[PDB]
Amino acid sequence: KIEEGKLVIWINGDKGYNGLAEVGKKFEKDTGIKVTVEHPDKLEEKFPQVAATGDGPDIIFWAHDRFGGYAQSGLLAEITPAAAFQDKLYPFTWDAVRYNGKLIAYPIAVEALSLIYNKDLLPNPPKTWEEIPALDKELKAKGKSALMFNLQEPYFTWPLIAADGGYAFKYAAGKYDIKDVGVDNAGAKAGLTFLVDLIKNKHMNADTDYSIAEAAFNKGETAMTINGPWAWSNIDTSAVNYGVTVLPTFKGQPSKPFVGVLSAGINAASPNKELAKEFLENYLLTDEGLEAVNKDKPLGAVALKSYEEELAKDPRIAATMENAQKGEIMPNIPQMSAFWYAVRTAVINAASGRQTVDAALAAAQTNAAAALKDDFQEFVDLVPVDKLVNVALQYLVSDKEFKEFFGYLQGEEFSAVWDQFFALNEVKDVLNYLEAADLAVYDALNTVADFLGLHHVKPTVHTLRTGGLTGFFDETVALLPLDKFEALFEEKLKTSPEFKAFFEKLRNLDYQKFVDFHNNSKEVQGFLQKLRSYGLDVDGFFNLVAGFFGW
Ligand SMILES: OC[C@H]1O[C@H](O[C@H]2[C@H](O)[C@@H](O)[C@@H](O)O[C@@H]2CO)[C@H](O)[C@@H](O)[C@@H]1O
Ligand SMILES: [Cl-]
Ligand SMILES: [Cl-]
Ligand code: NA
Ligand code: NA
């Protein structure tokens, strides 16, 4: 569990975590409370992993786009500043961290990518993407290259993809339409095609990552890079005389970076929420606190009005805000995780040659729009439903044990198990949730009820060999591609927020109420006894199920 009486903070290792630790030093000087600042890798994935178990940091720093999913998963405490504090930060930064009407983090700073260029190699940087191929030819004749930036993270390639028409989710009169994705329209294809052709023509290398591009630019090997304000400090340390300016245009349109608001959330499981609010409001989000972080690694245009009025005089910040104004604030909706994962795969596969731009973006378009109903269909698609029903039909008319038990299912005892199971408020909750997700679960269960109510079957010739109730389950499980299920299950938790959210709804279900249902109902107990009496390990089933959901 989270340790009480201290603060543990997670922030990405490219940010000013040493400056943040200096703020932690002042907090301890004043209060006696110790602050630990960590910067683990894959922070945006590590936090929901550990926080879901009730563990993790008291405070989590990341761009705001990830926080709606965290909040939906119940990982974040509501943020309720007093009026005077709220007024100290720009309204549009509070907007970035508002989800379902509640504030779910403190906004810190506005981040936008810019074009960073070597003034000595390139006194006049290009205004267009289209002229960069020729510039690289010219620079290649001098032992240099034109442009290197991180091609492993779609954050860096999105501004080009969006320039001539690409978009994540369509925004209209208030809301984002998570069914209207814009990653495979003509503008998106054109932008990614231009990136891939830069690689095909050897103006960039598909394996270039953050560290490679940073080293190349700061050691004077490449004339340009694309990065955010956090990167300026290392460039300062280098010998490079650099400028920060507007991103290049594509087809006459501005590059459109997805703008992030670095935000600080409080772990819902933290026993230190009051200390975290004091640290964030009265130590970090002050002129002195943000200056400490900013002098370590620049934050960008900070959310704090008083200090942004100083930083705004910096031409590098002017360029950051110019690029931000030409881009768009990221959504914070949970579906952003699907979007980023889909475009990540598309860019890497297209840049590697593994796929064409058209095929990679076509797959990303469908993946970014993933919905629970679509995910469920992929599981059904794996199941031979024709065969499963025939086994059930053969057993229903041919197998002695199956008939015995099917007959039991038509008595009062099971009728009461059935009516009482589906009267539980915990079960009705799941059914309505599925109906909200456009899965006709009531219709499906009433199809099962109509079948359990069967009194006559069409004539058929019986099968000669059946193996009782255990033989029925062995024969039907044998038709289930169980490895593919567990694989598909693992991918969907990564590619589909709605699938994860449904699993979380079951995981976080009040499992006790079901044990109450069992331990207090004689009809339920009998039902379970009968199953065991036919050789069916019901206990090994429930226990295995409880493990699946962590009950
Ligand atoms: O590349 C996808 C990734 O983009 C953004 O992450 C940024 C982050 O916002 C910046 O602060 C900086 O650290 O670079 C990261 C990209 O490497 C999204 O915020 C993130 O959720 C998304 O996965
Ligand atoms: Cl990287
Ligand atoms: Cl359906
Ligand atoms: Na307060
Ligand atoms: Na094309």
Coordinates of C-alpha atoms and ligand atoms in Angstrom, one line a residue:
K1 CA 0.0 0.0 0.0
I2 CA 0.9 3.7 -0.2
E3 CA 2.9 4.9 2.8
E4 CA 1.2 7.5 4.9
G5 CA 3.0 10.6 6.1
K6 CA 5.1 11.3 3.0
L7 CA 4.7 12.1 -0.7
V8 CA 5.8 10.0 -3.6
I9 CA 5.8 11.7 -6.9
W10 CA 6.1 10.2 -10.4
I11 CA 7.1 12.4 -13.4
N12 CA 8.6 11.6 -16.8
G13 CA 12.4 11.5 -16.9
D14 CA 12.6 14.1 -19.6
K15 CA 11.0 16.8 -17.3
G16 CA 12.7 18.9 -14.6
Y17 CA 12.5 16.3 -11.8
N18 CA 15.5 17.7 -10.1
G19 CA 13.9 21.1 -9.9
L20 CA 10.8 19.4 -8.6
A21 CA 12.9 17.7 -6.0
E22 CA 14.1 21.2 -5.0
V23 CA 10.5 22.1 -4.4
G24 CA 10.2 18.9 -2.3
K25 CA 13.3 20.1 -0.3
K26 CA 11.5 23.3 0.6
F27 CA 8.3 21.4 1.5
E28 CA 10.3 19.2 3.9
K29 CA 12.2 22.3 5.3
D30 CA 8.8 23.9 6.1
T31 CA 6.7 20.9 7.2
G32 CA 9.0 18.0 8.0
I33 CA 7.3 15.9 5.4
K34 CA 9.6 14.0 3.0
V35 CA 9.0 14.1 -0.7
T36 CA 10.4 11.4 -3.1
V37 CA 10.5 12.1 -6.8
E38 CA 10.8 9.1 -9.1
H39 CA 10.9 8.9 -12.9
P40 CA 10.2 5.4 -14.0
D41 CA 10.1 4.3 -17.6
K42 CA 6.7 3.8 -19.4
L43 CA 5.2 6.0 -16.7
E44 CA 1.9 6.5 -18.4
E45 CA 1.5 2.7 -18.5
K46 CA 3.1 1.9 -15.1
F47 CA 0.7 4.2 -13.2
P48 CA -2.6 2.7 -14.2
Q49 CA -1.1 -0.8 -13.7
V50 CA 0.0 -0.2 -10.1
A51 CA -2.7 2.3 -9.1
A52 CA -5.4 -0.2 -10.0
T53 CA -4.1 -2.3 -7.2
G54 CA -4.2 0.6 -4.8
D55 CA -0.4 1.1 -5.0
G56 CA 1.7 3.7 -6.7
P57 CA 2.6 7.4 -6.2
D58 CA 0.6 9.9 -4.3
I59 CA 1.0 12.3 -7.3
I60 CA 1.3 11.5 -11.0
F61 CA 2.6 13.9 -13.6
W62 CA 1.7 13.4 -17.3
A63 CA 0.0 15.2 -20.2
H64 CA -3.7 15.7 -19.6
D65 CA -4.7 13.3 -22.5
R66 CA -4.2 10.2 -20.3
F67 CA -6.2 11.4 -17.3
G68 CA -9.8 10.7 -18.5
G69 CA -8.9 7.0 -18.7
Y70 CA -7.3 7.2 -15.3
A71 CA -10.4 8.9 -13.8
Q72 CA -12.8 6.4 -15.5
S73 CA -10.8 3.6 -13.9
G74 CA -11.3 5.3 -10.5
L75 CA -7.6 6.1 -10.0
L76 CA -7.8 9.8 -9.4
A77 CA -9.1 12.0 -6.6
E78 CA -11.3 15.0 -7.5
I79 CA -9.5 18.3 -7.4
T80 CA -11.4 21.1 -5.6
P81 CA -9.4 24.3 -5.3
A82 CA -10.7 27.4 -3.6
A83 CA -11.8 30.2 -5.9
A84 CA -8.7 32.3 -5.3
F85 CA -6.4 29.5 -6.3
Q86 CA -8.4 28.4 -9.3
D87 CA -8.2 32.1 -10.5
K88 CA -4.4 31.9 -10.4
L89 CA -4.3 29.5 -13.4
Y90 CA -5.6 30.1 -16.9
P91 CA -9.2 28.9 -17.5
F92 CA -8.2 26.9 -20.6
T93 CA -5.7 24.9 -18.6
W94 CA -8.4 23.9 -16.1
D95 CA -10.5 22.9 -19.1
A96 CA -7.9 20.4 -20.1
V97 CA -8.2 18.6 -16.8
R98 CA -12.0 18.7 -16.5
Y99 CA -13.7 15.4 -17.1
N100 CA -17.4 14.6 -16.6
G101 CA -17.8 18.0 -15.0
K102 CA -15.1 17.4 -12.3
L103 CA -11.5 18.6 -12.1
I104 CA -9.2 15.5 -12.0
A105 CA -5.8 17.1 -11.8
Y106 CA -3.9 20.4 -11.4
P107 CA -2.7 21.9 -14.7
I108 CA 1.0 22.8 -14.7
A109 CA 2.2 23.9 -18.2
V110 CA 1.2 24.0 -21.9
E111 CA 3.4 21.8 -24.1
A112 CA 3.7 22.1 -27.9
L113 CA 6.3 20.8 -30.3
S114 CA 8.4 23.3 -32.2
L115 CA 11.1 23.2 -34.9
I116 CA 14.5 23.5 -33.4
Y117 CA 17.3 24.4 -35.8
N118 CA 21.1 25.0 -35.7
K119 CA 21.6 28.7 -36.5
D120 CA 25.2 28.1 -37.6
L121 CA 24.3 25.3 -40.1
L122 CA 21.1 26.9 -41.0
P123 CA 20.6 30.6 -40.5
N124 CA 17.2 30.5 -42.3
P125 CA 15.3 27.3 -41.4
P126 CA 12.8 26.0 -44.0
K127 CA 9.2 27.1 -43.9
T128 CA 7.9 24.0 -45.6
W129 CA 8.3 20.2 -45.3
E130 CA 8.5 20.0 -49.1
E131 CA 11.8 21.8 -49.3
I132 CA 13.5 19.6 -46.6
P133 CA 14.5 16.7 -49.1
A134 CA 16.5 19.2 -51.2
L135 CA 18.0 20.7 -48.0
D136 CA 19.2 17.3 -46.9
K137 CA 20.8 16.7 -50.2
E138 CA 22.7 20.0 -49.8
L139 CA 23.7 19.2 -46.2
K140 CA 24.6 15.6 -47.0
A141 CA 27.3 17.1 -49.3
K142 CA 28.8 18.7 -46.1
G143 CA 28.8 15.5 -44.0
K144 CA 25.5 16.5 -42.2
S145 CA 21.7 15.9 -42.4
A146 CA 18.7 18.2 -42.4
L147 CA 16.3 16.7 -39.9
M148 CA 16.3 14.0 -37.1
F149 CA 13.4 13.6 -34.6
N150 CA 11.8 10.8 -32.7
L151 CA 10.0 8.4 -35.1
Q152 CA 9.0 5.8 -32.4
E153 CA 6.4 8.0 -30.7
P154 CA 3.5 9.3 -32.9
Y155 CA 3.3 12.5 -30.8
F156 CA 6.2 13.7 -33.0
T157 CA 4.8 12.6 -36.3
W158 CA 1.2 13.6 -35.7
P159 CA 1.7 17.3 -36.5
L160 CA 2.6 16.3 -40.1
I161 CA -0.2 13.8 -40.4
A162 CA -2.7 16.3 -39.2
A163 CA -1.5 19.2 -41.3
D164 CA -3.6 18.6 -44.4
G165 CA -6.6 17.0 -42.8
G166 CA -5.8 14.2 -40.3
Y167 CA -7.6 14.3 -37.0
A168 CA -8.2 12.0 -34.1
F169 CA -11.9 12.3 -33.2
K170 CA -14.3 14.7 -34.9
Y171 CA -15.4 17.6 -32.6
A172 CA -18.8 19.1 -33.1
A173 CA -21.0 21.3 -30.8
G174 CA -19.4 20.2 -27.6
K175 CA -18.4 16.6 -27.9
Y176 CA -16.0 14.3 -29.7
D177 CA -17.5 11.7 -31.9
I178 CA -15.4 8.6 -31.1
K179 CA -17.0 6.8 -34.1
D180 CA -15.8 9.6 -36.5
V181 CA -12.0 9.0 -36.7
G182 CA -9.8 10.9 -39.1
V183 CA -6.6 8.9 -39.3
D184 CA -7.1 7.5 -42.8
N185 CA -8.5 10.4 -44.8
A186 CA -6.6 11.9 -47.7
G187 CA -4.8 14.5 -45.6
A188 CA -3.7 11.9 -43.1
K189 CA -2.4 9.6 -45.9
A190 CA -0.6 12.4 -47.6
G191 CA 1.3 13.4 -44.4
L192 CA 2.4 9.9 -43.5
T193 CA 3.3 9.2 -47.1
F194 CA 5.6 12.2 -47.0
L195 CA 7.2 10.9 -43.8
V196 CA 7.7 7.4 -45.3
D197 CA 9.2 8.9 -48.5
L198 CA 11.7 10.8 -46.4
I199 CA 12.8 7.4 -45.0
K200 CA 12.6 5.7 -48.4
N201 CA 14.8 8.4 -49.9
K202 CA 17.3 8.1 -47.0
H203 CA 16.6 11.6 -45.5
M204 CA 15.6 10.0 -42.2
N205 CA 16.1 6.6 -40.6
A206 CA 13.0 4.6 -39.4
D207 CA 15.0 3.5 -36.3
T208 CA 15.7 7.0 -35.0
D209 CA 14.3 7.4 -31.5
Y210 CA 14.3 10.3 -28.9
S211 CA 17.9 9.7 -27.7
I212 CA 19.4 9.3 -31.2
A213 CA 17.8 12.4 -32.5
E214 CA 18.7 14.5 -29.4
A215 CA 22.4 13.4 -29.5
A216 CA 22.6 14.1 -33.3
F217 CA 21.3 17.6 -32.9
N218 CA 23.1 18.5 -29.8
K219 CA 26.4 17.2 -31.2
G220 CA 25.9 19.3 -34.4
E221 CA 25.4 16.4 -36.8
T222 CA 21.9 17.4 -37.9
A223 CA 20.6 20.8 -38.8
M224 CA 17.1 20.4 -37.3
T225 CA 15.1 18.5 -34.7
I226 CA 11.5 18.5 -33.5
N227 CA 11.0 18.6 -29.7
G228 CA 9.3 20.3 -26.8
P229 CA 10.5 22.9 -24.3
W230 CA 11.9 20.3 -21.9
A231 CA 14.7 19.7 -24.5
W232 CA 16.1 23.2 -24.5
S233 CA 18.2 22.7 -21.4
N234 CA 20.4 20.0 -22.9
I235 CA 20.8 22.1 -26.0
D236 CA 22.0 24.9 -23.8
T237 CA 24.6 22.6 -22.3
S238 CA 25.9 21.8 -25.9
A239 CA 27.9 23.9 -28.2
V240 CA 25.0 24.4 -30.6
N241 CA 23.6 27.9 -31.3
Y242 CA 20.0 27.1 -31.7
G243 CA 16.7 28.7 -32.5
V244 CA 13.1 27.7 -31.8
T245 CA 10.5 28.5 -34.5
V246 CA 7.2 27.5 -36.1
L247 CA 7.0 24.0 -37.5
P248 CA 7.2 23.6 -41.3
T249 CA 4.0 23.8 -43.4
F250 CA 2.7 20.8 -45.4
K251 CA 0.8 21.5 -48.6
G252 CA 0.6 25.1 -47.5
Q253 CA -1.1 24.2 -44.2
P254 CA 0.5 24.6 -40.7
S255 CA 1.7 21.6 -38.9
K256 CA -0.8 20.9 -36.2
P257 CA 0.8 19.5 -33.0
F258 CA -1.4 17.9 -30.4
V259 CA -1.0 20.2 -27.5
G260 CA -0.5 18.7 -24.0
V261 CA -1.1 20.3 -20.6
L262 CA 1.4 18.8 -18.1
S263 CA -0.9 17.9 -15.2
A264 CA -0.6 16.6 -11.7
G265 CA -3.1 14.1 -10.4
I266 CA -3.6 12.7 -6.9
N267 CA -3.9 8.9 -6.5
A268 CA -7.4 8.0 -5.3
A269 CA -5.7 5.4 -3.0
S270 CA -3.4 8.0 -1.5
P271 CA -3.8 8.5 2.3
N272 CA -1.9 11.8 1.8
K273 CA -4.3 13.8 -0.2
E274 CA -4.3 16.8 2.0
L275 CA -0.5 16.9 2.0
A276 CA -0.5 16.5 -1.8
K277 CA -2.9 19.4 -2.2
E278 CA -0.7 21.6 0.0
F279 CA 2.4 20.7 -1.9
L280 CA 0.8 21.3 -5.3
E281 CA -1.1 24.5 -4.6
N282 CA 1.2 26.3 -2.1
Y283 CA 4.7 25.0 -3.2
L284 CA 4.7 23.9 -6.8
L285 CA 2.2 26.2 -8.4
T286 CA 3.9 29.4 -7.2
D287 CA 6.4 31.6 -9.0
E288 CA 9.3 30.1 -6.9
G289 CA 8.1 26.5 -7.4
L290 CA 7.7 26.7 -11.1
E291 CA 10.9 28.6 -11.5
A292 CA 12.8 25.8 -9.8
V293 CA 11.3 23.2 -12.2
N294 CA 11.7 25.4 -15.2
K295 CA 15.3 26.2 -14.6
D296 CA 16.0 22.5 -14.6
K297 CA 14.0 21.7 -17.7
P298 CA 11.7 24.3 -19.3
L299 CA 8.0 23.6 -18.8
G300 CA 6.7 25.7 -21.7
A301 CA 3.9 28.2 -21.2
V302 CA 3.0 27.6 -17.5
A303 CA -0.6 27.6 -16.3
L304 CA 0.2 30.0 -13.5
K305 CA -0.7 33.5 -14.8
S306 CA 1.8 35.5 -12.7
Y307 CA 4.8 33.5 -13.9
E308 CA 3.7 33.0 -17.5
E309 CA 3.8 36.7 -17.8
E310 CA 7.5 36.6 -17.3
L311 CA 8.1 33.5 -19.4
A312 CA 6.0 34.9 -22.3
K313 CA 8.8 37.4 -23.2
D314 CA 11.0 34.5 -24.2
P315 CA 11.0 34.0 -28.0
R316 CA 11.2 30.2 -27.6
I317 CA 7.9 30.4 -25.6
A318 CA 6.5 32.7 -28.3
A319 CA 7.2 30.0 -30.9
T320 CA 5.8 27.3 -28.6
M321 CA 2.6 29.2 -28.3
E322 CA 2.5 29.9 -32.0
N323 CA 2.8 26.2 -32.7
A324 CA 0.2 25.4 -30.0
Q325 CA -2.3 27.9 -31.5
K326 CA -1.9 26.2 -34.9
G327 CA -2.5 22.8 -33.4
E328 CA -5.2 21.5 -31.1
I329 CA -5.6 20.8 -27.4
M330 CA -5.6 17.0 -26.9
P331 CA -8.9 15.4 -25.8
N332 CA -8.7 13.8 -22.4
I333 CA -11.4 11.2 -23.1
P334 CA -10.5 7.6 -22.4
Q335 CA -10.5 6.7 -26.1
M336 CA -7.2 8.7 -26.6
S337 CA -5.3 5.6 -25.5
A338 CA -6.8 3.7 -28.4
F339 CA -6.0 6.5 -30.8
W340 CA -2.3 6.8 -29.7
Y341 CA -1.8 3.0 -29.8
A342 CA -3.3 2.7 -33.2
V343 CA -1.3 5.6 -34.8
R344 CA 1.9 4.3 -33.0
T345 CA 1.5 1.0 -34.8
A346 CA 0.6 2.6 -38.1
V347 CA 3.6 4.9 -38.2
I348 CA 6.1 2.2 -37.2
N349 CA 4.8 -0.3 -39.6
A350 CA 4.6 2.2 -42.5
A351 CA 8.0 3.7 -41.7
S352 CA 9.5 0.2 -41.6
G353 CA 8.0 -0.9 -44.9
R354 CA 6.1 -3.7 -43.2
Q355 CA 2.9 -2.1 -44.5
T356 CA 1.8 0.4 -47.0
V357 CA 0.6 3.8 -45.7
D358 CA -2.9 3.0 -47.0
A359 CA -3.0 -0.4 -45.2
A360 CA -1.4 0.9 -42.0
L361 CA -3.8 3.8 -41.7
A362 CA -6.8 1.7 -42.6
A363 CA -6.0 -0.6 -39.7
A364 CA -5.4 2.4 -37.4
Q365 CA -8.7 3.9 -38.4
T366 CA -10.6 0.8 -37.2
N367 CA -8.5 0.3 -34.1
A368 CA -8.9 3.9 -32.9
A369 CA -12.7 3.6 -33.2
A370 CA -12.8 0.3 -31.2
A371 CA -16.0 -0.2 -29.2
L372 CA -17.1 -3.0 -26.8
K373 CA -19.6 -4.3 -29.3
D374 CA -17.0 -4.7 -32.0
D375 CA -14.5 -6.4 -29.6
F376 CA -17.2 -8.9 -28.5
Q377 CA -17.8 -9.8 -32.2
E378 CA -14.1 -10.6 -32.6
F379 CA -14.4 -13.2 -29.9
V380 CA -17.6 -14.7 -31.4
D381 CA -15.9 -14.8 -34.8
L382 CA -13.4 -17.3 -33.3
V383 CA -16.2 -19.7 -32.0
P384 CA -17.7 -22.4 -34.2
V385 CA -21.3 -21.6 -33.2
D386 CA -22.8 -24.1 -35.7
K387 CA -20.9 -27.0 -34.1
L388 CA -21.4 -26.0 -30.5
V389 CA -25.2 -25.9 -31.0
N390 CA -25.2 -29.3 -32.7
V391 CA -23.3 -30.9 -29.8
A392 CA -25.9 -29.5 -27.4
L393 CA -28.7 -30.8 -29.7
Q394 CA -27.1 -34.3 -30.0
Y395 CA -26.7 -34.5 -26.2
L396 CA -30.2 -33.1 -25.4
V397 CA -31.8 -36.1 -27.3
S398 CA -29.1 -38.7 -27.0
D399 CA -27.3 -38.4 -23.6
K400 CA -28.9 -39.7 -20.4
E401 CA -27.1 -37.4 -18.0
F402 CA -27.8 -34.3 -20.1
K403 CA -31.5 -35.2 -20.1
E404 CA -31.4 -35.7 -16.4
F405 CA -29.9 -32.3 -15.8
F406 CA -31.9 -30.5 -18.4
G407 CA -34.9 -31.9 -16.7
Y408 CA -33.7 -30.5 -13.3
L409 CA -33.4 -27.1 -15.0
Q410 CA -37.2 -27.0 -15.5
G411 CA -38.0 -27.4 -11.8
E412 CA -38.8 -24.7 -9.2
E413 CA -35.3 -25.0 -7.7
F414 CA -33.5 -23.7 -10.8
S415 CA -36.4 -21.3 -11.7
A416 CA -35.7 -19.6 -8.3
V417 CA -31.9 -19.6 -8.8
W418 CA -32.6 -18.0 -12.2
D419 CA -35.1 -15.4 -11.1
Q420 CA -33.1 -14.5 -8.0
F421 CA -29.8 -14.4 -9.8
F422 CA -31.1 -11.9 -12.4
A423 CA -32.9 -9.9 -9.7
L424 CA -29.6 -9.1 -7.9
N425 CA -28.9 -5.4 -8.3
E426 CA -25.3 -6.3 -9.1
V427 CA -26.4 -8.4 -12.1
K428 CA -29.0 -5.9 -13.4
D429 CA -26.2 -3.3 -13.2
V430 CA -24.0 -5.4 -15.6
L431 CA -26.9 -6.1 -18.0
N432 CA -27.9 -2.5 -18.3
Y433 CA -24.2 -1.5 -18.8
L434 CA -24.0 -4.0 -21.7
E435 CA -27.3 -2.7 -23.2
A436 CA -25.8 0.8 -22.9
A437 CA -22.9 -0.5 -25.0
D438 CA -25.4 -1.8 -27.6
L439 CA -25.1 -5.5 -26.7
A440 CA -28.6 -7.1 -26.8
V441 CA -27.9 -9.1 -23.6
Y442 CA -31.6 -9.2 -22.4
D443 CA -32.6 -10.6 -25.8
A444 CA -29.8 -13.1 -25.6
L445 CA -30.7 -14.4 -22.1
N446 CA -34.4 -14.7 -23.2
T447 CA -33.2 -16.8 -26.1
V448 CA -31.6 -19.1 -23.5
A449 CA -34.8 -19.0 -21.5
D450 CA -36.9 -20.0 -24.6
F451 CA -34.5 -22.9 -25.2
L452 CA -34.6 -24.0 -21.5
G453 CA -38.4 -24.0 -22.0
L454 CA -38.3 -26.4 -24.9
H455 CA -40.8 -29.3 -24.6
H456 CA -40.5 -30.8 -28.1
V457 CA -37.6 -31.1 -30.7
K458 CA -37.8 -31.8 -34.4
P459 CA -37.1 -35.5 -35.1
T460 CA -33.5 -36.5 -35.6
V461 CA -31.4 -39.7 -35.6
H462 CA -29.5 -39.9 -32.4
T463 CA -25.8 -40.2 -32.1
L464 CA -24.4 -43.5 -30.8
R465 CA -21.7 -42.1 -28.5
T466 CA -22.1 -39.5 -25.7
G467 CA -20.1 -39.1 -22.5
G468 CA -22.6 -37.6 -20.0
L469 CA -22.3 -34.1 -18.5
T470 CA -18.5 -34.2 -18.3
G471 CA -18.4 -35.5 -21.8
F472 CA -20.6 -32.6 -23.0
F473 CA -18.3 -30.0 -21.4
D474 CA -15.1 -31.7 -22.7
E475 CA -16.6 -31.9 -26.2
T476 CA -17.8 -28.3 -26.2
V477 CA -14.6 -26.8 -24.6
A478 CA -12.6 -28.7 -27.3
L479 CA -14.3 -26.4 -29.9
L480 CA -13.2 -23.2 -28.0
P481 CA -9.9 -21.8 -29.3
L482 CA -8.8 -21.0 -25.7
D483 CA -5.3 -19.7 -26.5
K484 CA -6.6 -17.2 -29.0
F485 CA -9.2 -16.0 -26.4
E486 CA -6.5 -15.3 -23.9
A487 CA -4.3 -13.7 -26.6
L488 CA -7.2 -11.6 -28.0
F489 CA -8.1 -10.7 -24.4
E490 CA -4.6 -9.4 -23.7
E491 CA -4.4 -7.3 -26.9
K492 CA -7.9 -5.7 -26.3
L493 CA -6.9 -4.5 -22.8
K494 CA -4.1 -2.6 -24.6
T495 CA -6.0 -1.5 -27.8
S496 CA -9.5 -0.9 -26.4
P497 CA -10.4 1.3 -23.4
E498 CA -14.1 0.2 -23.5
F499 CA -13.0 -3.4 -23.2
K500 CA -10.7 -2.6 -20.3
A501 CA -13.4 -0.5 -18.7
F502 CA -15.9 -3.4 -18.9
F503 CA -13.3 -5.8 -17.4
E504 CA -12.7 -3.2 -14.7
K505 CA -16.4 -3.0 -14.0
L506 CA -16.4 -6.8 -13.3
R507 CA -13.1 -6.7 -11.4
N508 CA -14.4 -3.9 -9.1
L509 CA -17.7 -5.7 -8.6
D510 CA -18.9 -6.4 -5.1
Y511 CA -18.1 -10.1 -5.3
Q512 CA -19.3 -10.6 -1.7
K513 CA -22.9 -10.0 -2.7
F514 CA -22.7 -13.2 -4.8
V515 CA -21.3 -15.2 -1.8
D516 CA -24.2 -13.8 0.2
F517 CA -26.5 -15.0 -2.5
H518 CA -25.0 -18.4 -2.4
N519 CA -24.5 -18.9 1.4
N520 CA -28.0 -17.7 2.1
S521 CA -29.9 -19.5 -0.6
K522 CA -30.6 -23.2 -0.3
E523 CA -31.7 -23.4 -3.9
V524 CA -28.4 -22.0 -5.1
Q525 CA -26.5 -24.5 -2.9
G526 CA -28.5 -27.4 -4.3
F527 CA -27.8 -26.3 -7.9
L528 CA -24.1 -26.3 -7.1
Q529 CA -24.3 -29.7 -5.3
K530 CA -26.0 -31.3 -8.3
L531 CA -23.3 -30.0 -10.7
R532 CA -20.6 -31.5 -8.4
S533 CA -22.6 -34.7 -8.2
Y534 CA -22.3 -35.1 -12.0
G535 CA -18.5 -34.9 -11.7
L536 CA -18.2 -31.2 -12.5
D537 CA -15.6 -29.4 -10.5
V538 CA -17.6 -26.3 -9.7
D539 CA -15.2 -25.2 -6.9
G540 CA -12.2 -25.3 -9.3
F541 CA -14.4 -23.2 -11.6
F542 CA -15.4 -20.4 -9.2
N543 CA -11.9 -20.2 -7.6
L544 CA -10.4 -20.0 -11.1
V545 CA -13.0 -17.3 -12.0
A546 CA -12.3 -15.4 -8.8
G547 CA -8.6 -15.4 -9.8
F548 CA -9.4 -14.0 -13.2
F549 CA -11.0 -10.9 -11.7
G550 CA -8.9 -10.7 -8.5
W551 CA -11.7 -11.3 -6.0
Ligands
LIG1 O1 3.5 9.4 -28.7 C1 2.2 9.2 -28.1 C2 2.2 9.9 -26.7 O2 2.1 11.3 -26.9 C3 2.1 12.1 -25.8 O3 3.1 11.9 -24.9 C4 4.1 12.9 -24.9 C5 4.0 13.8 -23.7 O4 2.8 14.5 -23.7 C6 5.1 14.9 -23.6 O5 5.0 15.5 -22.3 C7 6.5 14.2 -23.9 O6 7.0 13.7 -22.7 O7 6.5 13.3 -24.9 C8 5.5 12.2 -24.9 C9 5.7 11.5 -26.1 O8 6.9 10.7 -26.0 C10 0.8 11.8 -25.0 O9 0.7 12.6 -23.8 C11 0.8 10.3 -24.6 O10 -0.3 9.9 -23.9 C12 0.9 9.5 -25.9 O11 0.9 8.1 -25.6
CL2 CL 12.0 7.0 -28.0
CL3 CL -26.0 -8.0 -30.0
NA4 NA -8.3 24.3 -0.9
NA5 NA -1.0 8.0 -51.1

